[PDB]
Amino acid sequence: MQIFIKTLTGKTITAETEPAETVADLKQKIADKEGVPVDQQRLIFAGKQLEDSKTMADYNIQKESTLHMVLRLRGG
Numbered sequence: 001m002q003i004f005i006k007t008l009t010g011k012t013i014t015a016e017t018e019p020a021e022t023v024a025d026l027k028q029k030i031a032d033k034e035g036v037p038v039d040q041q042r043l044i045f046a047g048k049q050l051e052d053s054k055t056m057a058d059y060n061i062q063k064e065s066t067l068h069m070v071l072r073l074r075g076g
Contacts (some may be wrong), residue, residue: 026043
């Protein structure tokens with residue numbers, strides 16, 4: 001039950017997450033991966049803002065579901 005995620009750079013990111021922490025997982029995973037706080041990392045689906053209280057099952061998005069990953073450096 002894994003999905004496909006792509007970034008602005010065209011990178012391919014694919015990893016399975018929990019139905020209870022779908023966004024939080026990608027937020028923390030990428031947070032420590034880029035060295036930035038989850039506050040700077042957000043997930044969007046076709047223009048849909050996903051919150052920590054939302055998951056793939058919630059948006060009924062699966063099966064090679066396309067996702068968007070945006071990363072920004074801290075400055076302050």
